Tab-separated table of C-alpha atoms and ligand atoms in Angstrom:
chain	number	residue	atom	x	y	z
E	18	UNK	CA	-90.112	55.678	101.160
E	19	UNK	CA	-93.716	56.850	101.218
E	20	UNK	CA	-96.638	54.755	99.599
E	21	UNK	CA	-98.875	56.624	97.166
E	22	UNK	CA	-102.578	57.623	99.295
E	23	UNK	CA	-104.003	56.029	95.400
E	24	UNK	CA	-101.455	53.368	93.998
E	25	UNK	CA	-100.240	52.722	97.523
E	26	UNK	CA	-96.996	50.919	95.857
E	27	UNK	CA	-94.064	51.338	97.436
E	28	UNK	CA	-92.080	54.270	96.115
E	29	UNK	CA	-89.706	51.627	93.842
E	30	UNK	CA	-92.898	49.269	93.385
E	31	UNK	CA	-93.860	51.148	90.316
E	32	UNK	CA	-91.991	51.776	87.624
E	33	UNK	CA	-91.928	55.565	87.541
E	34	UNK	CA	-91.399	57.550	90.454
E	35	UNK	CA	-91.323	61.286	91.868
E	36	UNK	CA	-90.130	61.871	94.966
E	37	UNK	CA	-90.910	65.593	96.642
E	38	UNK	CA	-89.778	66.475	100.258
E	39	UNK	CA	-93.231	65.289	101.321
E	40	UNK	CA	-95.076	63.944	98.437
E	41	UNK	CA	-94.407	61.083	96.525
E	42	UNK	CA	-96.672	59.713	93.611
E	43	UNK	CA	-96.493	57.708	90.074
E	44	UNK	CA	-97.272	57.868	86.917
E	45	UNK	CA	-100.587	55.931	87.688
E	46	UNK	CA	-102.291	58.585	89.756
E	47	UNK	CA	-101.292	61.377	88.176
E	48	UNK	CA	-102.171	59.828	84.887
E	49	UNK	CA	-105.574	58.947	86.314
E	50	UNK	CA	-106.322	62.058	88.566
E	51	UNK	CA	-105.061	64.640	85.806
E	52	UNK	CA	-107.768	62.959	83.446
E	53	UNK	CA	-110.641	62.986	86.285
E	54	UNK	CA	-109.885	66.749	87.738
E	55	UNK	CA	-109.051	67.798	84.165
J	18	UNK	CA	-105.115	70.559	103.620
J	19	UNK	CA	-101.664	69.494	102.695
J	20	UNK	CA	-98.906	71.701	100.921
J	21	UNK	CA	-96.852	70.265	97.385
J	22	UNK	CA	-94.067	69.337	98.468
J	23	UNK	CA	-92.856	70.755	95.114
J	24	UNK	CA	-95.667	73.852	94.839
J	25	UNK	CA	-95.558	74.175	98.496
J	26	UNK	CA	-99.225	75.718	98.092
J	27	UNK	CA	-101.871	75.381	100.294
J	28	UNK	CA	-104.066	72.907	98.673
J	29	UNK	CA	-106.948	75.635	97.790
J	30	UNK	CA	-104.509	77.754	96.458
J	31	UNK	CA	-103.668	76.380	93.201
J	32	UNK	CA	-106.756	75.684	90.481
J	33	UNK	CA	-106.474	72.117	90.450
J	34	UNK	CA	-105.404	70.111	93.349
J	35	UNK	CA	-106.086	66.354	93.221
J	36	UNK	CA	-106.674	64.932	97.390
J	37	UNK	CA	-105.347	61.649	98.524
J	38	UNK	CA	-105.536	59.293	101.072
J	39	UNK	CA	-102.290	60.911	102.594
J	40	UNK	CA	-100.984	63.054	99.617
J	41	UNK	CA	-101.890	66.233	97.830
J	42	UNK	CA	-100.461	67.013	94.532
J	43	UNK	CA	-102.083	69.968	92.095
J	44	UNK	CA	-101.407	70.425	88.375
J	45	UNK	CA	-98.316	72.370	88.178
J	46	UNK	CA	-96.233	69.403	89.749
J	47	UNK	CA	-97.340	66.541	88.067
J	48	UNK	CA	-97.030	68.989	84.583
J	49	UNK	CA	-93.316	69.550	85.396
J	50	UNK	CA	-92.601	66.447	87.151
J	51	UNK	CA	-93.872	64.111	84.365
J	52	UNK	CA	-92.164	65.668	81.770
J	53	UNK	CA	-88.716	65.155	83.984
J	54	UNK	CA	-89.966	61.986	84.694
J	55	UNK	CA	-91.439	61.005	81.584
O	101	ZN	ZN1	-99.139	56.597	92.576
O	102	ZN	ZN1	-98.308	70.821	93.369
C-alpha cells in the first residue's frame, strides 16, 4: 500500500511488514533509525 | 509534523520520534510493533 519514506519498498517488497492506519514501515528502518535516534 | 498512526502523537510529543521522507514513527510503535512482528 504505502512505500516506506527510508526503504521505499513496497509494503509486501520486504519481508516484514507493519501496517498502521497511516504509517507503514519495516524491519529495516526501524532497525536502523532505533539504533541512530537511540 | 505527522501523527503515529499507532501513537497517534504529535511528532514532538513523544521522546523519540524518527522523521521520514513521508512517515513518522517514534519509539513506542516500533517497540510494540516489532515484537508482534518479530
Ligand atoms: Zn522500511
Ligand atoms: Zn509512534
Amino acid at each position: 500500500l504505502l512505500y516506506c519514506s527510508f526503504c521505499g519498498k513496497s509494503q509486501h517488497e520486504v519481508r516484514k511488514l507493519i501496517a498502521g492506519p497511516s504509517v507503514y514501515i519495516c524491519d529495516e528502518c526501524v532497525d536502523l533509525c532505533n539504533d541512530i535516534i537511540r
